[PDB]
Design a protein around this ligand. Sequence first.
Ligand SMILES: C[Se]C[C@H]1O[C@@H](OCC[Si](C)(C)C)[C@H](O)[C@@H](O)[C@@H]1O[C@@H]1O[C@H](CO)[C@H](O)[C@H](O)[C@H]1O
Length: 142
Amino acid sequence: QAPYLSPAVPFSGTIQGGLQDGLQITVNGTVLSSSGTRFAVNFQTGFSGNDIAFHFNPRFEDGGYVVCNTRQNGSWGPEERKTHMPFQKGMPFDLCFLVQSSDFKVMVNGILFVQYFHRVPFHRVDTISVNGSVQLSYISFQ
Ligand SMILES: C[Se]C[C@H]1O[C@@H](OCC[Si](C)(C)C)[C@H](O)[C@@H](O)[C@@H]1O[C@@H]1O[C@H](CO)[C@H](O)[C@H](O)[C@H]1O
């Protein structure tokens, strides 16, 4: 699949073929400086946002932390939080998602940041969405 180039935020776009074991998704962009305190990347089914297999949500709040969760039919599950905040307001990032058989691995600027165990089948994910305090240069699939 060809990359999404300069997609406007909020963005949602199809992942051709769906998530597959071994697929790497790169999100390259820049956190905005003075335009809110959260952004999110969502791996989801369709365009509604009610079924999100993996919600990755950095929050520049309470010292900085990231939330990971899953939404099923509108309902959020148990939150996983890491206090490590590897993003900075105004700064560019390379955010890499790797789909593996039991989990996602998430790399930020070349360093493993978190994993997230699958709670729903990843093959049902056909769409990526990005929202909040970020601008995007590209989303690639490889
Ligand atoms: C308005 Se209810 C949802 C919020 O629940 C909050 O828990 C509230 C518990 Si009491 C009502 C006992 C004080 C969570 O801290 C918050 O992170 C959580 O926020 C959601 O978190 C979700 C992830 O779990 C999404 O990020 C969603 O966007 C965000 O609104």
